[PDB]
Design a protein around this motif. Structure first.
Motif, PDB file in Angstrom:
ATOM      1  N   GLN B 240      40.870  14.106  51.401  1.00  0.00           N
ATOM      2  CA  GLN B 240      41.683  13.236  50.559  1.00  0.00           C
ATOM      3  C   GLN B 240      43.050  13.851  50.297  1.00  0.00           C
ATOM      4  N   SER B 241      43.097  15.168  50.087  1.00  0.00           N
ATOM      5  CA  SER B 241      44.371  15.843  49.863  1.00  0.00           C
ATOM      6  C   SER B 241      45.260  15.781  51.098  1.00  0.00           C
ATOM      7  N   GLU B 242      44.665  15.861  52.290  1.00  0.00           N
ATOM      8  CA  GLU B 242      45.447  15.735  53.516  1.00  0.00           C
ATOM      9  C   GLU B 242      46.111  14.368  53.604  1.00  0.00           C
ATOM     10  N   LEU B 243      45.396  13.317  53.202  1.00  0.00           N
ATOM     11  CA  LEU B 243      45.970  11.977  53.226  1.00  0.00           C
ATOM     12  C   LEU B 243      47.037  11.812  52.153  1.00  0.00           C
ATOM     13  N   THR B 244      46.805  12.371  50.964  1.00  0.00           N
ATOM     14  CA  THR B 244      47.815  12.313  49.911  1.00  0.00           C
ATOM     15  C   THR B 244      49.079  13.055  50.321  1.00  0.00           C
ATOM     16  N   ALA B 245      48.926  14.230  50.934  1.00  0.00           N
ATOM     17  CA  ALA B 245      50.084  14.977  51.410  1.00  0.00           C
ATOM     18  C   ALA B 245      50.846  14.201  52.475  1.00  0.00           C
ATOM     19  N   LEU B 246      50.126  13.592  53.418  1.00  0.00           N
ATOM     20  CA  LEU B 246      50.783  12.874  54.503  1.00  0.00           C
ATOM     21  C   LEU B 246      51.393  11.570  54.010  1.00  0.00           C
ATOM     22  N   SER B 247      50.757  10.924  53.032  1.00  0.00           N
ATOM     23  CA  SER B 247      51.287   9.671  52.503  1.00  0.00           C
ATOM     24  C   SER B 247      52.638   9.877  51.836  1.00  0.00           C
ATOM     25  N   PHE B 285      72.972   3.785  46.560  1.00  0.00           N
ATOM     26  CA  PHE B 285      72.261   4.247  45.374  1.00  0.00           C
ATOM     27  C   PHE B 285      71.102   3.329  45.019  1.00  0.00           C
ATOM     28  N   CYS B 286      71.205   2.042  45.349  1.00  0.00           N
ATOM     29  CA  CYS B 286      70.057   1.154  45.199  1.00  0.00           C
ATOM     30  C   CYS B 286      68.924   1.578  46.125  1.00  0.00           C
ATOM     31  N   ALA B 287      69.248   1.887  47.382  1.00  0.00           N
ATOM     32  CA  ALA B 287      68.229   2.351  48.316  1.00  0.00           C
ATOM     33  C   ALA B 287      67.678   3.712  47.918  1.00  0.00           C
ATOM     34  N   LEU B 288      68.516   4.571  47.338  1.00  0.00           N
ATOM     35  CA  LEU B 288      68.058   5.887  46.909  1.00  0.00           C
ATOM     36  C   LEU B 288      67.147   5.799  45.693  1.00  0.00           C
ATOM     37  N   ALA B 289      67.354   4.806  44.831  1.00  0.00           N
ATOM     38  CA  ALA B 289      66.618   4.706  43.578  1.00  0.00           C
ATOM     39  C   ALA B 289      65.472   3.709  43.618  1.00  0.00           C
ATOM     40  N   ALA B 290      65.554   2.676  44.459  1.00  0.00           N
ATOM     41  CA  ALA B 290      64.555   1.615  44.425  1.00  0.00           C
ATOM     42  C   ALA B 290      63.201   2.060  44.954  1.00  0.00           C
ATOM     43  N   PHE B 291      63.146   3.246  45.566  1.00  0.00           N
ATOM     44  CA  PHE B 291      61.864   3.729  46.143  1.00  0.00           C
ATOM     45  C   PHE B 291      60.889   4.165  45.044  1.00  0.00           C
ATOM     46  N   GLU B 292      61.391   4.518  43.857  1.00  0.00           N
ATOM     47  CA  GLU B 292      60.470   4.855  42.783  1.00  0.00           C
ATOM     48  C   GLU B 292      59.606   3.670  42.380  1.00  0.00           C
ATOM     49  N   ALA B 293      59.933   2.464  42.851  1.00  0.00           N
ATOM     50  CA  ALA B 293      59.027   1.334  42.697  1.00  0.00           C
ATOM     51  C   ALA B 293      57.838   1.445  43.639  1.00  0.00           C
ATOM     52  N   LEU B 294      58.023   2.092  44.789  1.00  0.00           N
ATOM     53  CA  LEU B 294      56.971   2.272  45.779  1.00  0.00           C
ATOM     54  C   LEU B 294      56.288   3.628  45.657  1.00  0.00           C
ATOM     55  N   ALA B 295      56.559   4.365  44.587  1.00  0.00           N
ATOM     56  CA  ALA B 295      55.930   5.662  44.377  1.00  0.00           C
ATOM     57  C   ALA B 295      54.455   5.520  44.001  1.00  0.00           C
ATOM     58  N   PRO B 296      54.086   4.705  43.001  1.00  0.00           N
ATOM     59  CA  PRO B 296      52.653   4.599  42.676  1.00  0.00           C
ATOM     60  C   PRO B 296      51.849   3.873  43.739  1.00  0.00           C
ATOM     61  N   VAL B 297      52.514   3.107  44.605  1.00  0.00           N
ATOM     62  CA  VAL B 297      51.811   2.362  45.646  1.00  0.00           C
ATOM     63  C   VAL B 297      51.289   3.313  46.718  1.00  0.00           C
ATOM     64  N   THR B 298      51.844   4.528  46.772  1.00  0.00           N
ATOM     65  CA  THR B 298      51.483   5.478  47.820  1.00  0.00           C
ATOM     66  C   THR B 298      49.984   5.751  47.837  1.00  0.00           C
ATOM     67  N   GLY B 299      49.449   6.273  46.740  1.00  0.00           N
ATOM     68  CA  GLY B 299      48.040   6.570  46.629  1.00  0.00           C
ATOM     69  C   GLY B 299      47.193   5.463  46.058  1.00  0.00           C
ATOM     70  N   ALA B 300      47.767   4.276  45.857  1.00  0.00           N
ATOM     71  CA  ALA B 300      47.017   3.170  45.274  1.00  0.00           C
ATOM     72  C   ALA B 300      45.860   2.759  46.174  1.00  0.00           C
ATOM     73  N   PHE B 301      46.103   2.693  47.483  1.00  0.00           N
ATOM     74  CA  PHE B 301      45.053   2.265  48.398  1.00  0.00           C
ATOM     75  C   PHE B 301      44.154   3.425  48.801  1.00  0.00           C
ATOM     76  N   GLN B 302      44.483   4.641  48.365  1.00  0.00           N
ATOM     77  CA  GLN B 302      43.540   5.746  48.503  1.00  0.00           C
ATOM     78  C   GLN B 302      42.585   5.786  47.318  1.00  0.00           C
ATOM     79  N   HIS B 303      43.033   5.297  46.161  1.00  0.00           N
ATOM     80  CA  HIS B 303      42.111   5.017  45.068  1.00  0.00           C
ATOM     81  C   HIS B 303      41.185   3.866  45.428  1.00  0.00           C
TER      82      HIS B 303
END
Ligand code: ATP
Ligand code: ATP
Ligand code: MG
Ligand code: MG
Lengths: 585, 563
Positions: B240-247, B285-303
């Motif tokens: 699971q940690s390998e997938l979290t690291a790679l995600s 700066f929109c592209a640099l900042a708007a990714f924090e919207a996709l931060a929790p989605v990273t491990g959401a489907f690993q949960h």
């Protein structure tokens, strides 16, 4: 108690020396991510100034784009490494902490395991040890990064502006202050959180094991309220623990969001001429504004993370309180005995003013003075609750004793536990079957026993008569708490264990419990034969049969008040004759 | 994936706070993105304006925007955590009582299909994991997606080509990356859910049986098997940690892609004009900042892979149908109970032979009946038929000439008192270990029955307040036997089923208890299973069972004459 917390933190930090090489790599990798963030910010700021201010077309800018792309790839690679390096630090420590706890549970015995519910041991081993991962994986490497990376960022900004660098350090000192005042109670809140979880988990498995009694008395509606109360105490503790984390994270984001505002406002005003102090007596450049704006969130990132992982440390301190207490409390003996008797011959038991005490400290059996020569067999007789099973639990090394109890002249405290238990086999009271199948239970003493020797135990303990009733014969599963078997059928499987491996000392605690007048005779003729091969001590209530045992110990209120052979005691009156008088009516 | 449907229906009972915790998540992300997006443009627009354009360029409105967005960012995130967590842990409450409510209806036989340590995992641990569904699998997904639409729509006014380019990178990432990591981490989440419950079972079984395992030297060889489960469990945690690291690495690389593209593309022109001016920094700066919207989605489907595995375990337990059912017809508890059995036969689950073969006896009200027989002859299987533990097969049991299946459960429990062969000492206090039967009894009533059975020394020190069972004082074999008699005496039911009540008691105490039962159980129907032939002359009938069938029946005096 703040003094207790430092004791727990010293204990927690000592366990991290196994994975010191892992923590050091993560600290190095986190610092490298600091450099790569500055390099990325410098190139993005430099690119933007060229395109906007000086209006170079993009076809000229390829070196900054190529270096920016390389910096992004290096950033992703270090992130990939640091996540895996952090995990290995936590895993190897958690595997070592759990081994120490399981080591002490082996030496604790049934008496010390019964000092906590089995569902509360499980959450101590599973939940409380697994919840120290973020303390080792993420918090320990972050203390250095919380000081190194923020200083590295600001040093890169002093050449640009001395004021934009002072804006970050203007709001910086409040962050460590607020992190500690908020988290002053976060470690005790977690300790009560794991106390409510252990209480909820132990309460559940207690009602699950005794769910037959609950069904008999119709406690369906009452036990739903008990779980609702236990689960609501746990919910309020969890929300209390979480509310500190949200408050601490909200405070740290408030200063982070404030600082970005001033950096935006100060630079935006400076370009317009309303401010002049920040720059080094030279016109303010656009790259300086972008560099300090891209690096403003990353100056506090190492500090917001420290606040995030600070409450992971409080989760480990709360989780280590119940652990350290279990490690602290002495077991049945002050020091692990190393002496071991050599001969497999029957042992001699010698007691002198022996007192047996519970784990808490209550005395269970009073002053016991007796002698049992090697090869002789004795019977414990007396009223219920008079300390007969306590003496047999002391001879097994389960209970702590105060006087003297010497085996072959060696104090039982000093005997090696693993070596002593190989010369001892016995049938407990209300015996249990831990294995899966019925063969696996009878063969518990030695799994690799010959089929002939397996058959002898089954025949001797009368287990072979009900084997046809079972679907898989001797290989049928006994179920959970031997549900597949009846009480008298499981009792004979317990007797089969004791007769399979010969040993120096055989103890018997009502070996013929819940057996009718006939199956008892079949079992007793096996135990009467098996009691002549070594030293034997049997706790029974069938006063009539035992006309040949070497000595009888009539125990009353924890004291052996009458010892002698059955011939004289049956006719000498006193406690034994009166006790036998109520029998045989 | 469809196993989550029964648990998405629990979203309805908190639809106001759970949806509020999503609106406040979108607001926080829009303010978080706006703070960097506005600040980035403000500097560039100010820089282009220069000193000369001081008065023409409006520099008060953007200055208030960065200050306003900085407070919405911090206040919004604080409340959306409070609202979403407060509602999530009250849905967790109903999910745990609802799961626990199913265990007792299927107690004797339904619970035998499971292991107790793994059932403790489901109710306590698996329920908590299944509760992660809203906080980190649903709220991140729908909160992020709305922010993608708002950012893309907002940027679309400036330039269509740039807006769908940033939106296309972001929206494509949201739709095809989480499923890719779900398929990758689905197997790990099943093994990580299976091995946590396997370790808890092997640990509680190892701890509970530590008396026997220590004496026979099986503690070490059962701990080795326990340690092997942890090794596999730690490998699943490692995978699971390998997938979290790679995600996280791929999102940072995708995070780079939009920033590079916005830098490259917006340079050519924003809004159709070749000289974008400050508008280049608006998209970067929109592209640099708007990714924090996709931060929790990273491990959401690993949960998600681990949430679905848990959802399967609870759905397994809560969908079991108990083999014993009770009507809702209220009835008054009788004062005298006489039961008749006519050719009652019972086969235990997954067996071929019959535990009971045509038991037939008629017990009149006020009769005391003694049941004798060999071990394993069906004595305690009979006494559980009378308790509606299982349903008899082509047999009939009648209480007071009325079917036993027609009694309400609340009324059935009050007409029968049982002393089980295997007494249980609960973890609760001495008072609470006796309030199972007769909850309304006062402490004087509890203390009175304790002295009647001979447990006067349980009232010493703490007494009624003293804790018993695991985590407290453990009782002896004879004290546990007289505590079950004290429970049945307090119940005061018309029909009393005693399963060897004087087992493990010496001669003196057993006579003291049998005499107590003689006067307390007077004018009460008693079915007392025993293995001791002592004192059966006071029983109206004697039953001798052999291999699940009644062999002899009659008065003790009659049985001795017929040999
Ligand atoms: N859960 C179960 N599943 C299948 N068979 C069972 C189960 N429980 C008991 N049996 C079988 O039923 C038979 C008799 O059961 P029962 O417990 O009524 O005997 P018993 O007379 O109570 O024994 P004892 O007199 O020793 O208490 C036994 O041979 C046993 O193997
Ligand atoms: N863990 C404990 N803590 C406190 N008291 C205990 C504990 N275990 C046993 N006792 C007390 O010790 C007394 C005697 O214990 P023990 O079981 O040795 O007597 P016994 O003769 O074996 O009883 P029985 O004949 O019913 O098995 C009991 O009254 C019991 O209350
Ligand atoms: Mg005992
Ligand atoms: Mg039975």
């Amino acid at each position: 108690n703040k003094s207790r917390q430092k004791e727990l933190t010293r204990w927690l930090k000592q366990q991290s020396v196994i994975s010191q090489r892992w923590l050091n790599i993560s600290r190095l990798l986190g610092f490298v991510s600091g450099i790569l963030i500055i390099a990325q910010a410098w190139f993005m700021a430099r690119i933007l100034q060229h395109m906007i201010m000086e209006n170079i077309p993009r076809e000229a800018l390829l070196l900054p784009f190529t270096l920016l792309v390389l910096t992004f790839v290096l950033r992703a690679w270090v992130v990939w490494l640091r996540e895996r390096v952090g995990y290995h630090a936590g895993q190897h420590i958690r595997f070592a902490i759990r081994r120490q706890v399981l080591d002490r549970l082996q030496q604790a015995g049934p008496a010390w395991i019964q000092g906590k519910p089995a569902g509360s041991w499980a959450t101590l081993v599973l939940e409380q040890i697994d919840d120290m991962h973020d303390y080792y994986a993420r918090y320990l490497p972050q203390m250095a990064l919380a000081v190194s990376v923020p200083l590295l960022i600001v040093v890169a900004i002093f050449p640009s502006n001395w004021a934009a660098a002072l804006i970050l350090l203007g709001t910086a000192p409040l962050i460590p202050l607020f992190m500690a005042l908020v988290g002053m109670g976060a470690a005790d809140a977690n300790r009560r959180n794991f106390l409510a979880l252990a209480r909820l988990s132990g309460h559940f498995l207690d009602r699950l094991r005794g769910m037959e009694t609950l069904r008999i008395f119709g406690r369906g509606e009452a036990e739903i309220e008990s779980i609702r109360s236990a689960s609501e105490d746990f919910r309020q503790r969890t929300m209390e623990v979480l509310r500190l984390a949200f408050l601490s994270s909200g405070i740290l984001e408030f200063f982070t969001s404030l600082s970005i505002a001033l950096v935006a406002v100060y630079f935006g005003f400076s370009y317009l001429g309303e401010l002049d102090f920040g720059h080094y007596d030279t016109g303010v450049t656009l790259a300086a504004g972008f560099l300090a704006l891209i690096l403003a969130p990353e100056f506090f990132q190492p500090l917001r993370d420290l606040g995030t992982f600070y409450h992971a440390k409080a989760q480990a301190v709360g989780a280590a309180d119940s652990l350290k207490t279990f490690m602290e409390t002495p077991l049945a003996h002050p020091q692990r005995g190393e002496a071991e008797l050599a001969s497999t011959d029957p042992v001699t038991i010698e007691a002198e003013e022996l007192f047996i005490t519970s784990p808490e400290g209550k005395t269970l059996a009073g002053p016991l003075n007796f002698t049992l020569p090697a090869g002789q067999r004795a019977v414990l007789v007396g009223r219920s609750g008079s300390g007969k099973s306590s003496l047999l639990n002391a001879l097994s090394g389960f209970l702590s004793y105060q006087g003297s109890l010497r085996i072959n002249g060696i104090e039982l405290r000093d005997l090696s536990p693993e070596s002593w238990r190989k010369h001892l086999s016995w049938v407990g009271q209300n015996p249990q079957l831990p294995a899966a199948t019925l063969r696996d239970n009878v063969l518990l003493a030695r799994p690799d026993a010959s089929e002939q020797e397996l058959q002898a135990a089954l025949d001797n303990a009368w287990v072979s008569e009900f084997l046809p009733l079972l679907p898989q014969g001797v290989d049928t599963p006994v179920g959970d708490q031997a549900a597949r078997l009846s009480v008298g059928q499981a009792q004979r499987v317990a007797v089969a264990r004791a007769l399979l491996n010969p040993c120096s000392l055989l103890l018997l605690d009502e070996p013929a419990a819940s057996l009718d007048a006939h199956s008892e005779q079949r079992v007793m003729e096996a135990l009467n034969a098996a009691s002549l091969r070594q030293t034997t001590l049997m706790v029974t209530h069938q006063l009539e049969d035992l006309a040949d045992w070497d000595v009888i110990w009539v125990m009353q209120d924890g004291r052996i008040i009458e010892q002698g052979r059955y011939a004289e005691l049956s006719v000498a009156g006193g406690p034994f004759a009166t006790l036998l008088a109520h029998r045989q009516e | 994936m469809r196993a989550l449907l029964p648990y998405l229906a629990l979203y309805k009972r908190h639809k106001w706070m759970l949806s509020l915790g999503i609106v406040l998540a979108i607001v926080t992300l829009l303010a978080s993105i706006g703070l960097l997006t506005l600040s980035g443009w403000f500097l560039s627009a100010s820089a282009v304006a220069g000193v000369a354009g001081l008065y023409s360029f409006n520099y008060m409105l953007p200055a208030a925007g960065v200050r306003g967005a900085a407070i919405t960012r911090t206040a919004g995130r604080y409340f959306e955590r409070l609202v979403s967590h407060d509602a999530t842990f009250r849905v967790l409450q109903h999910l745990r009582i609802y799961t626990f409510s199913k265990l007792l209806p299927l107690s004797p036989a339904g619970l035998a299909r499971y292991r107790q340590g793994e059932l403790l995992n489901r109710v306590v641990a698996d329920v908590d994991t299944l509760d992660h569904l809203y906080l980190r699998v649903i709220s991140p997904l729908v909160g992020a997606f709305v922010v993608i639409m708002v950012v893309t729509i907002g940027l679309s006014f400036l330039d269509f080509t740039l807006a769908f380019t940033l939106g296309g990178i972001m929206l494509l990432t949201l739709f095809l990356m989480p499923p890719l990591f779900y398929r990758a981490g689905k197997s790990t989440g099943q093994n990580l859910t299976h091995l946590r419950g396997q370790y808890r079972q092997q640990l509680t079984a190892w701890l509970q049986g530590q008396a026997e395992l220590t004496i026979f030297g099986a503690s070490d060889r059962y701990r080795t098997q326990l340690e092997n489960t942890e090794i596999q469990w730690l490998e699943a945690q490692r995978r699971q940690s390998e997938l979290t690291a790679l995600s996280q690495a791929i999102m940072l690389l995708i995070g780079a892609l939009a920033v590079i593209l916005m830098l490259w593309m917006a340079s050519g022109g924003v809004g159709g004009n070749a000289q974008p001016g400050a508008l280049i920094a608006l998209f970067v700066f929109c592209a640099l900042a708007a990714f924090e919207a996709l931060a929790p989605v990273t491990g959401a489907f690993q949960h998600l892979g681990q949430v679905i595995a848990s959802a399967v375990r609870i759905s397994d337990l809560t969908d079991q149908k108990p083999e014993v059912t009770f009507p809702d017809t209220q009835t008054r508890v009788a004062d005298r109970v006489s039961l008749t059995l006519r050719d009652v036969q019972f086969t235990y689950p997954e067996q071929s032979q019959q535990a009971l073969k045509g038991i037939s006896l008629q017990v009149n009200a006020g009769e005391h009946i003694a049941i004798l027989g060999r071990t394993g002859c069906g004595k305690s299987t009979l006494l559980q038929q009378l308790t509606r533990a299982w349903d008899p097969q082509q047999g009939e049991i009648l209480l007071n000439d009325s079917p036993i299946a027609s009694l309400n459960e609340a009324a059935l429990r009050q007409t029968i008192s049982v002393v089980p062969q295997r007494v249980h000492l609960f973890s609760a206090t001495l008072r609470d270990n006796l309030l199972l039967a007769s909850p309304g009894s006062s402490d004087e009533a509890l203390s009175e029955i304790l002295r009647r059975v001979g447990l006067e020394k349980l009232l010493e020190d703490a007494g009624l307040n003293s804790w018993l069972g695991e985590g407290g004082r453990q009782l002896s074999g004879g004290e546990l036997r007289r505590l079950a008699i004290a429970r049945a005496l307090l119940h005061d039911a018309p029909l009393v089923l005693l399963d060897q009540p004087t087992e493990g008691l010496d001669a003196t105490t057993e006579s003291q208890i049998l005499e107590l039962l003689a006067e307390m159980m007077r004018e009460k129907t008693v079915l007392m299973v025993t293995h001791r032939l002592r004192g059966l002359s006071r029983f109206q009938q004697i039953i001798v069972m052999d291999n699940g069938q009644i062999i002899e029946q009659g008065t003790h005096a009659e049985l001795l004459a017929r040999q």
